[PDB]
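Quick entry between incubations.
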Amino acid sequence: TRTLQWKCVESRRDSKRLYYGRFILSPLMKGQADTIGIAMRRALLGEIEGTCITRAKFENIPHDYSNIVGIQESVHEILMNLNEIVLKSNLYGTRNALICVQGPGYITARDIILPPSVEIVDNTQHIATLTEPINLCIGLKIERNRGYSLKMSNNFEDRSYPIDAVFMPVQNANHSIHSYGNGNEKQEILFIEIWTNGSLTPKEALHEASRNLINLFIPFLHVEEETFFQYIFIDQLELPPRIYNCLKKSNIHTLLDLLNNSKLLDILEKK
Amino acid sequence: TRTLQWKCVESRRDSKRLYYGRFILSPLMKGQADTIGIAMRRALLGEIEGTCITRAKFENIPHDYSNIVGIQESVHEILMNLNEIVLKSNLYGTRNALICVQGPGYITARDIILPPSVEIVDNTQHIATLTEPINLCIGLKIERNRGYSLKMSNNFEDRSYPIDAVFMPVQNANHSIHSYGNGNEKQEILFIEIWTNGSLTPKEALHEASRNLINLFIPFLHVEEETFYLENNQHQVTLPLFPFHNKLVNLRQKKKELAFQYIFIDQLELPPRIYNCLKKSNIHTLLDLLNNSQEDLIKMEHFHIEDVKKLLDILEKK
Amino acid sequence: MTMDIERLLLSEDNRFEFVNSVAAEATEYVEKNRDEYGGTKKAIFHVLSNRVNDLGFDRPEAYAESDPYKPGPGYLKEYYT
Amino acid sequence: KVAGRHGNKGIISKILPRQDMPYLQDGRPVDMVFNPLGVPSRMNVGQIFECSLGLAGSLLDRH
Amino acid sequence: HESEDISHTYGWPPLVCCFGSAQHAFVPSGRPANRLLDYERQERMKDAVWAPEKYIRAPGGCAGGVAIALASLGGKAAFMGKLGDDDFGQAMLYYLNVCQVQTRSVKIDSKRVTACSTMKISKRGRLKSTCVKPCAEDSLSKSEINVDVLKEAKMFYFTTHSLLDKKMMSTTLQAIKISKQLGNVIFYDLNLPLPLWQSLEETKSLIQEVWDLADVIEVTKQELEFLCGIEPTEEFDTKNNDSSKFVHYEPETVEPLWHENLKILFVTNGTSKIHYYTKEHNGAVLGMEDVPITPFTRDMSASGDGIVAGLIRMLTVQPDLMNDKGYLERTARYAIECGVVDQWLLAQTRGYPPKDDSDPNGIRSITEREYRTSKPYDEPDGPYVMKPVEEREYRKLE
Amino acid sequence: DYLVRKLSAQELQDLVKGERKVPLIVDFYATWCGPCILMAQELEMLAVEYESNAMIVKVDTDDEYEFARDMQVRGLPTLFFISPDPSKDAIRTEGLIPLQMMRDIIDNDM
Amino acid sequence: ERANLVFHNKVIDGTAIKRLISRLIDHFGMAYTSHILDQVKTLGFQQA
Amino acid sequence: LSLHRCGLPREIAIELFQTFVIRGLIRQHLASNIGVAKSQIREKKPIVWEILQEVMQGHPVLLNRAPTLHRLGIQSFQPILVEGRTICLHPLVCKGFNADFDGDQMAVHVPLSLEAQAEARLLMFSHMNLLSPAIGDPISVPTQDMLIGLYVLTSGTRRGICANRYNPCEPFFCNSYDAIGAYRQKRINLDSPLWLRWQLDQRVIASKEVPIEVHYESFGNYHEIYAHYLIVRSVKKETLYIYIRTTVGHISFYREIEEAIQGFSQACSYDT
Amino acid sequence: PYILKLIHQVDDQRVGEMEVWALEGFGVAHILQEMLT
Ligand SMILES: [Ca+2]
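Done. Structure below.
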């Protein structure tokens, strides 16, 4: 009676970096809801592109120590704060972001000079605290990859400190199945529950996961253009002893073993 | 030519009702093979329809556990033989078939009178053995469905003994993920091997699973439910614009004026800065704008106290 | 309700008097309104919801909940055992 | 109630579709899943031997 | 005539101004085309999968359809055009709004009527038609141009259908010049209308003054051959994926249509194959076109709208990677996937016409399941149904 | 009975050059056009509703391509509404127009 | 409100979990621990 | 199932709630009298199951093991209508009943009087009887594979010679959510060591030992490497950075308890 | 392994004296009365 339709039943935004969304898909035949929920969860967790800082270059700072003057936070803690920055972007490849700031004050995500296609989800995120009137320039490395992907190149070693950034824009995902019976009408209802870090709304993550899943199974529909006698043994057939020993050394006992390896043939072909 | 290629690396026809096909998909970026593999695994095993006999109707027997003179097999043996035959059909619905023959001899699947929709796969499958020249006629029902036939009583009909049909045509499936060893983006190689009962070749089952999977994730790309206007009866409109047009003509005839939930801030001649801020705050309709408060508007980023004043008088003119 | 049941017992002196008081009040409710506490609303649950609301907190009446995602009148939610 | 010949009795609590039962490296899903905790407490290792030999017999077509 | 620098409130993704008409379901034309198809599957699926006798693909739809398609892709699309203040105009205006398309650039006219232009039928010599009253989406004036929308938009989109009326053409040229002056990339989807497919010479003169102004031009393979004068030599409706039917024309053949402003030329053969040409790079991306199609969606117009929407989506987000071969390969592939999805969605939305042995606008449709449902073949006289003992005609065994 | 009748260009000239007692509706359609098939279904029941009070005629633009260009048919589906009185002008509608609008176009305004 | 639990870092076993349930009951009450047991039961079953 | 719930089959539930279902049919005017309702129940109309579903809602039943063992041999659960023809029971309460699954049959009784239903819900429910009166120890302690799964989670990293082939002579996660997320993305194993940036106070239970090694920098910052955590203090400042060396399993177990408490607190929102 | 199917489901109430002790331990006097009524 009904058609397969989806709807958002719950939608909460109790943060600038924590969005919640619950979605319903119905009616579904028996066994389909589990398949959709499993695949969608995999797409949401790793197949969705995420943008975050991967490397940090401390320009004009030859200290190379764990701490620098004028900044309360240690160098390692600054990288930790950078790793928490939530970014949304459509960039292809890699870009460069710069943080050149004044003396005393608070360095926040609002102070990051951004490449054209990227945005700061929450500009209030704290990077570092400045005490002494000293300028600080930071060379960021903005990259956009999937959660499941892995990268090995790390700019070798040129005083650029790598940031082990996790590329998940969907913090968590879960699916639930509700089955309703009417005597013989077994329909299933699929609930999709998505948590995002604000880089994309849960409704958007639902569409991207669906599109990424479809793009995976499109190639299976691709087409390409067109252009215009174990029971007989070598013992029985009369063979020279020289040839017989050579075959026996190579575990060629039957004739099938002989044809599987490639005046021997002249005598053999007649029988 | 394509960077991502797939091919049937091995196809085998072990028997009339056991087709083996192995397929490769390379190169896949890390994590895609795992996602594709499991989804293909579940789609092949339980998302491919098959067609087979659902119930058989004899004439002169009292029950499916009696013996027919001239037949070397019991009636229950016949039903299991019928349950074993393999049929192929791309169409849905329940269809009739006939085994009206006379013996003596061997009754095989080739002796079944099939409708044009369905085709026999293995015509050599044994059904019954006739020892004396009797006239045997069996009425058959053929149906295409998912999963397996419900194993519950449905024999209230004219002695059509139900047959516990198993519609799934993929006997088994397997997939393996191998590292491509690229060392630059962690590519992977996916293998898929499919066993089918001959009702469809493994290549067809590979395509059918992919198409069935797409039809499962394509609904999320449809528009959200209750987005367009409807008469809340059909729930399925080919042209989503027309049901709203039918509202306006009725509205114009009654002269009741359009509701606020259908008037968007685009039509309100707002300043561009005001319009952008409202859209950023996910405020699209006039009704949604009215439900907010002045304080709820001041808290917006590029919104000032002077703007809520000029916004109000624009609404006042309307 | 389980937390609410314990919360009521926290201010109680004897848990056997509490259940007797609840049963006595539940019997009083059903006598006044016979045709209310038969289905989705239970007499005892209504007492517990009221006693929590008396403390100044908010609970749904008799802790009754509907199924907003129920498709049709004949469709009853099968439980995945 | 299902049971082996080594005193490993069992009640059937769940029936799952073949696509979500655990499957081997040849892709075949298992037909029944037993609790491994039964063996150490009940101390019947014969089922462990019978289980492995049954797989070998079916593949080699032996009894 | 300008205003304050309001660029600080422009939100990513950049706005796209889809200028043109807002027709409901209206294809410009349709040319014979070749689909990259698996014909072995078609042979075994002929009874359950509907396939047209002759495969003819429309270049796309109206400019509003692209805006709807672009909005569904997550892009920010604004439609610039004119609509009447009648039942259809408000219905279409609501349709764009509910599809997340900005309509602040849509001018609502009370004098005009939506898609009901009056015609004067001459019948003295050979019967003609002259436009006494242009329809609502043909009377847009140069004053009725939301410059603020053009200031915000980083890409201007228009089609050849906006050049069929002189009043429209002057406004269309005016909008492009303003967008060019504002630094907006000009996208020109050809979508050649039906009359323009005859007398090639007038078609070139019609679009020559606007061809040089477009930074990005998207034309179909059939349209490219028509403009270049190439005669279609490949066969049509032949059960084979011959490489001749999907031929990547060399850049030398594209050179006569090139100009200094042009940066990318997109040649689309549907979702089967998309060709891109730049000053340095050229190439093509293979796709698929074995999508579910019904008689209601056989024109493939949804693929055309989806393809250009995906092209606009990729180019706007990375305007500096337009002359990048790697990005163009991903852009063309992304456009194919968008076109495939849109055509797949349309088939489920519209369904199939009912078979041959309760609706305000009389439209009868059936779902894919109902279209694949077979007749029971339960006729008492049929050979598939049990008959009385008189006419059993028991076949003899071996 | 009464339905949409297939006519060619010369079958439409004498229709508009000659007498017209009831409004004449010209359907410029093509078999390859998806929306035109939908457009036909509306005209299938519009003809039933207006019976002999109006006339419905379909013209194939694939064959009459030269004639459609003269009519300035800019695309498909395109409907031409011809008043029975030659004094009044015609109405050209482009796009999949709703059934209700066709009612008021032929009963009044023409 | 953050719960002031203790971050068990070494290992938990039959005796360790039994002590934890005893401390949870004596600190949060039986209603809380009944829910904690269900979450623990699901966690143990899932990871087993 | 939940700790306080039990599943009843349709054919068993209808027998126990025969009277209450009839009352529901008469109350809602579906059945004119008792005779119609009893015939209607035998007809097994779809409405009957809907009435039965709402009737059992909120009505506890008593589950009794005929070879009774403890005071928990008879206990009260909230029944829910479940498919099949067998009584589903919670795994934890099957230990209080000693309910082996090589064969067992329970007797279920439905309290009728409102007083009986009151004390069944308020005195015999499993959520109020968690301590054995013998000594005051918990009864619903996880056992069997529930205890195995928790043991595997908390069985942390391999240490010493079991982790490195040669004598030496790891990822840093800013919060537990990233550590869990990285584990989901197969980036790290369950037992793989990792450093968790600890924002709370010192909370892990480790043997009270002096730091293994203190890296005292000349600028006042000194790191204290303990057996299980790293603490970064300074002389100029009082930053007090703490990094815990742990696994996803310990984080998952700790997060499960913390989420259970917060989830229960939010559901029982007395603040509002 | 070789797995058999058993006969219990094919081949095939009283409250005992111990259940009274358990009910008394809970102090459910009305429930205990309901059993013996
Ligand atoms: Ca085009």
